[PDB]
Design a protein around this ligand. Structure first.
Ligand code: A1D8X
Lengths: 57, 127, 282, 230, 336
């Protein structure tokens, strides 16, 4: 009976997904905001680099 | 989640009618070409009906042409297949599997054994 | 008036110059347009650009003023360059026609029969054979070798200097610069038209169960209307005792120049692969 | 300007050169064919002579043909077939004898035809097992009307060319399959591709010549379209 | 015996969705309405990289941000030098049907793979390039492979299973099954401890490299997923799908955050990649060009038009200096 084995594996995976400490989506949004703000001036694409420092002139 | 739960069917004598419907969730139903592939016990999956994105182009497999009829309600997010004048050979499990890409006519891989976007299935028994 | 006529000639010259310049820079710049057919088209555009920058401006002076305003040796060099560049343009037309004949009637063994080696051979033949023929004949003075008194009378009657062809030289320049390339294009545009109609008919019949006309009409009509009058009138003159008026010669000559004016249009702008590519940079 | 920089530039030059000769040697006078179909078909027996992903390189008249046969991947072919978006043609093979799988053969054909990436890819349709179809229709135990109700109102085409020996029922059946395929072929064609029917048998030897002529027509029509002659 | 287990799975799914709804206090779009806009981020093709004779199917930037390897159907696996436009190497591929390529973090190795179902490893730094290894065992085609180090490689496959390989040993050390459709792309975490992968079942699952089984599965997409890449923070990733939608999922929140799609766009995404900061979500659509998004604002903030054919691959350097897009037009363009 491989079908019931696959169903049992799916149940185990689903309850692994269930017993997960999900933080608040507001907290996740704040974390992403903080990361983007911290790396705001470190990203060449977000903040364009001068041509002298730019290696792809 | 792209989930397709089927409803209807059951047991009926030959010549009967059992309208099949399936609720669709997780995707913009009005943008995906629909299908009604079936699987008979002991035979491979068989594509039965078809519809267009807006229900204009409609095609049926030869064995059930005319007897069956598909119809799509975008607002209800349900695909309707009316089987009238059933035959004993119709006994099978029916899947209202859509096809993966939106805004397209080519449903390339629907009758595959492990298609991702196929429904759970309705066992229709005709005897 | 002379001013309006010169305005017409200068409009033609700027048109041909800019068209061939666009074509030259488009094939030279864009990497995707490095096909051997594109190289024939680029060489033809170079021929037309050189013609419009080196012959047409002085043909303007010889036209509007009806008299040469330059040196005699300069006049021989000018006639030399005119004949070479015109025969070069017609040779390029014939070689593009041969290219398309292979691309259509031998689609499979096409890139193995028409590669950069064969193209460059075609370009060499289209630039050198006109050079040899034109420069040699006109400078070793064969234009009227065998008929001197009539030539002297004609060049003393009127005009500072004009192109003069004897009977033998006239027939030779005809069957060297117009006829043979013209016949080649005619035969390789008629066969292509037959193939294209037949293919169009087959598709139509399958479906029920003429763009070629437009395209080949544009090509062959432009070539014929811009060359054949001049060449036939040039051939008749030795056999008709030089009767046609000089203004007729002027009109025929500038139709021959209008061919090079419309070549960058017909052979480049017409096809979609060039219109879109130009829009990338413009 | 340094010695290392000069060496790197020279290395780039030789790499570009080598790429050049390799591409001109490979891509010249060669054509790639993607072979599709089902197991019961003559999938591997179309071209009898000159024999993961399979391959079959054959030449007809100085022209090279690479005929790929994917037969190792999973059933879901909606993804890996995107790689064959440049092949000259697709050698579709149909098991005309067995009508049960013939409907999903039509479904595969319509999916290939209407695919966004396989749109400009012509199909050299090889209706195979013609002899088996002949014996089946002569036996008459299985009637094609059951699997297709449109057979009743169908009529044999006037342009059809009967073979020296063929029953009219055989001709009607085979041309009905052919026309059922050309229905999809002519439904949604952008003129960028065409289906080329060719009734073939497992014992036929002219399949290579058929593919040669069909690819010649495909490339000729593509050239005519490119040069605005079509 | 199966209906009972299906009911149990249904109620676990109901529990999971209820937990996600409870945790969904507010969306990042609602929390960022006061954020100043990024503005129009225009990018120009800095160094066009021509030389491929056929379609380009994949690329991978080097960890030095200088050497990018590209795989094409022509049979080559060139390793370009974006600084000087110098092809350092031109590896001849036995099977022209390549579908992916990767560059080792050290740089000593480069990998390929495709419809031949074999991941071929190459010694890019060799004393004498030869075929270093011929990792085989997958049944389906290879969609995307990545290097954990010079000895471990994770290769996604079309047989719905992505496996972890010991290069020198020669067989799959760990196999990550669970997908119901063909896995299409891979993405290794910044800490190289977890990797997510979208598949042909519109689901992206989070695997632990060592533990060996799926940890979290995200189902928010409508059609096949074609691309995936973690956020630089490592707690989130974005996935491109055939439904023309980029979707930001966060690992901790265990559910969707943002949706990057518009009515104008219809072509699906073939390649997505976050920027260095994560404020940009460059993605490559089928409509012959790429679109630059804004992860915080979910608003498109630029385009990368200039490719003739469909864009197949797209990657940003580790220092985020410049992005290179490889398209079917046989050309690689570095967009700084
Ligand atoms: C003089 C001569 C030829 F002998 C052959 C072709 C062309 C010319 C000149 C005069 O007419 C034009 N357009 N070029």
């Amino acid at each position: 009976t491989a079908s019931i084995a696959q169903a049992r594996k799916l149940v185990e995976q689903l309850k692994m997904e269930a017993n997960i400490d999900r933080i608040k989506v507001s907290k996740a949004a704040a974390d992403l905001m903080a990361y983007c703000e911290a790396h705001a001036k470190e990203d060449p694409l977000l903040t364009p680099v001068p041509a002298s420092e730019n290696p792809f002139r | 989640q792209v989930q397709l739960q089927e409803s209807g069917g059951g047991l009926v004598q030959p010549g009967g009618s059992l309208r099949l419907s399936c609720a669709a969730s997780g995707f913009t139903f009005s943008n995906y070409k629909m299908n009604w592939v079936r699987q008979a016990p002991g035979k491979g999956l068989e594509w039965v009906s078809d519809i267009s994105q807006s229900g204009a182009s409609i095609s049926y497999t030869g064995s059930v042409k005319g007897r069956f009829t598909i119809s799509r309600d975008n607002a209800k997010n349900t695909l309707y297949l009316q089987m009238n004048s059933l035959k004993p050979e119709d006994t099978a499990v029916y899947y209202c599997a859509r096809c993966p890409a939106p805004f397209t006519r080519d449903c390339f891989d629907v009758t595959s054994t492990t298609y991702a976007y196929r429904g759970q299935g309705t066992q229709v028994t005709v005897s | 008036v002379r001013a309006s006529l010169y305005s017409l000639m200068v409009l033609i010259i700027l048109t041909t110059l800019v068209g061939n310049l666009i074509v030259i820079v488009s094939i030279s710049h864009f990497k995707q347009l490095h096909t051997p057919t594109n190289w024939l088209i680029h060489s033809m555009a170079t021929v037309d650009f050189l013609l419009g920058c080196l012959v047409m401006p002085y043909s303007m002076v010889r036209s509007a003023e009806h008299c040469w305003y330059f040196g005699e040796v300069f006049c021989k060099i000018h006639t030399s360059t005119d004949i070479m560049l015109s025969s070069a343009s017609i040779f390029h037309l014939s070689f593009i026609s041969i290219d398309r004949y292979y691309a259509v009637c031998d689609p499979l063994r096409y890139k193995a029969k028409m590669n950069i080696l064969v193209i460059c051979v075609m370009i060499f033949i289209s630039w050198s054979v006109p050079a040899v023929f034109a420069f040699g004949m006109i400078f070793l003075e064969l234009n009227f070798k065998g008929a001197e008194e009539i030539y002297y009378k004609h060049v003393h009657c009127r005009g500072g200097c004009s192109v003069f062809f004897s009977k033998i030289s006239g027939v030779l320049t005809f069957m060297t610069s117009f006829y043979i390339p013209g016949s080649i294009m005619l035969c390789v545009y008629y066969r292509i038209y037959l193939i294209a109609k037949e293919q169009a008919r087959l598709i139509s019949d399958a479906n029920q169960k003429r763009k070629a006309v437009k395209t080949l009409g544009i090509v062959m009509g432009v070539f014929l209307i811009c060359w054949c009058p001049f060449f036939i009138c040039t051939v008749m003159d030795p056999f008709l005792h030089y009767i046609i008026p000089p203004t007729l010669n002027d009109v025929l000559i500038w139709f021959g120049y209008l061919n090079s004016t419309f070549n960058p249009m017909v052979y480049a702008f017409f096809y979609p692969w060039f219109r879109k590519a130009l829009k990338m940079m413009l | 300007v340094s010695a290392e920089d000069k060496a790197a530039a020279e290395r780039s030059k030789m790499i570009d050169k080598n790429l050049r000769e390799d591409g001109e040697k490979a891509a010249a006078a060669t054509h790639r064919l993607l072979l599709l179909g089902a197991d019961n078909s003559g999938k591997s027996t179309i071209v009898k002579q000159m024999r993961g992903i399979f391959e079959t390189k054959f030449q007809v008249d100085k022209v090279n043909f690479h005929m790929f046969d994917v037969g190792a991947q999973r059933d879901e072919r909606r993804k890996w077939i995107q790689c064959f978006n440049d092949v000259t043609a697709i050698i579709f093979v149909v098991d005309s004898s067995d009508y049960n799988r013939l409907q999903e053969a039509l479904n595969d054909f319509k999916s290939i035809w209407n695919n966004r990436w396989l749109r400009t890819i012509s199909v050299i349709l090889f209706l195979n097992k013609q002899d088996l179809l002949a014996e089946k229709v002569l036996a008459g135990k299985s009637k094609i009307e059951d699997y297709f109700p449109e057979f009743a109102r169908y009529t044999t085409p006037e342009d059809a060319t009967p073979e020296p020996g063929e029953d009219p029922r055989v001709t009607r059946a085979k041309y009905f399959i052919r026309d059922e395929f050309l229905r999809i072929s002519t439904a949604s064609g952008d003129g960028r591709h065409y289906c080329y029917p060719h009734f073939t048998c497992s014992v036929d030897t002219e399949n290579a010549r058929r593919i040669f002529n069909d690819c010649r027509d495909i490339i000729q029509r593509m050239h005519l379209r490119q040069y605005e002659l079509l | 015996e199966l209906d009972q287990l299906r009911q149990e799975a249904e109620q676990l799914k109901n529990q999971i969705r209820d937990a996600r709804k409870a945790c969904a206090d507010a969306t990042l779009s609602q929390i960022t309405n006061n954020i100043d806009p990024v503005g129009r981020i225009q990018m120009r093709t800095r160094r066009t990289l021509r030389g491929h004779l056929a379609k380009i199917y994949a690329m991978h930037w080097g960890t030095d941000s200088r050497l990018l390897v590209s795989a094409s159907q022509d049979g080559k696996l060139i390793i370009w030098d974006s600084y000087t436009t110098n092809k350092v190497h031109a590896i001849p591929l036995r099977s022209s049907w390549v579908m992916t390529c990767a560059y080792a973090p050290s740089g000593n190795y480069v990998a390929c793979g495709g419809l031949d179902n074999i991941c071929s490893i190459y010694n890019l730094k060799t004393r004498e390039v030869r075929v270093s290894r011929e990792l085989a065992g997958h049944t389906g085609y290879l969609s995307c492979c990545r290097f954990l180090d010079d000895n471990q490689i994770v290769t996604s496959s079309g047989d719905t299973t992505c496996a972890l390989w010991d290069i020198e040993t020669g067989q799959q050390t760990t196999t990550f099954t669970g997908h119901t459709g063909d896995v299409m792309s891979l993405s290794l975490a910044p800490d190289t401890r977890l990797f997510v992968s979208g598949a042909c079942d519109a689901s992206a699952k989070l695997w632990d490299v060592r533990e060996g089984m799926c940890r979290q599965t995200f189902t928010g997409h409508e059609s096949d997923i074609n691309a995936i890449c973690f956020f630089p923070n490592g707690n989130a990733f974005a996935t491109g799908s055939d439904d023309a939608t980029c979707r930001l999922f966060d690992l901790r929140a265990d559910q969707e955050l943002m949706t990057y799609s518009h009515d104008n766009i219809i072509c699906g995404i073939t390649s997505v990649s976050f920027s260095k900061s994560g404020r940009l979500l460059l993605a490559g659509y089928d409509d012959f060009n790429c679109n630059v998004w804004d992860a915080l604002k979910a608003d498109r903030a630029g385009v990368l038009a200039g490719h003739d054919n469909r864009v197949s691959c797209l990657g940003v350097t580790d220092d985020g200096m410049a992005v290179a897009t490889g398209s079917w037009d046989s050309f690689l363009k570095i967009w700084n």
